[PDB]
Design a binder for this molecule. Sequence first.
Ligand SMILES: CCCCCCCCCCCCCC(=O)O
Length: 209
Amino acid sequence: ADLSELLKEGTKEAHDRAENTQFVKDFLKGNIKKELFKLATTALYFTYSALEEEMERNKDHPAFAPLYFPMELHRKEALTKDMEYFFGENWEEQVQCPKAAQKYVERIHYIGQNEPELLVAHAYTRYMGDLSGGQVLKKVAQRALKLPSTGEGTQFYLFENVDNAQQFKQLYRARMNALDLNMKTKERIVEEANKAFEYNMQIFNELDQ
Ligand SMILES: CCCCCCCCCCCCCC(=O)O
């Protein structure tokens, strides 16, 4: 069956578990204060820094190259702007990676250096969710934190180079389903995606504290 279909069915439960964490339910209610949002944003910066370093490393690898979208998808530059807004120009000295995020970052580096055919599990799960959810999450955070109308602090959530998210999600899915993969590796990709949702849940719960 289609890898996209296997990922939908094989990750529904782990997806729902992460969506039902206390941090997510508080955020969507607007109950997320600035300092804690700065920590959550720090976690994203280190996560997407790692993910995009590994996608660039495998940009020519046949099990990943069709999904290399630096212009359309990469978030590191956007997150850098958000970190500069929330912390100021010397933001890099002010942060440290949260422990569960550091564990996810290590797993991304391992996957990209040792099992590049699984890197899609992380890219799909992160960027397809980002594209669907960006506008909703941006509005919630701008209102709750009273952020500037001009978009400072929420550039992570805006895909400046994706004209239409539903058309791009469709293109991305069709390319993923066309990767030449047997059922052995497709099942590992589903298990790696569930692994990602687990790291996701662990980062949320570390934020909740
Ligand atoms: C989903 C709505 C809340 C967004 C708040 C930002 C905090 C993100 C924590 C998750 C980090 C990525 C983990 C993963 O790879 O799944």
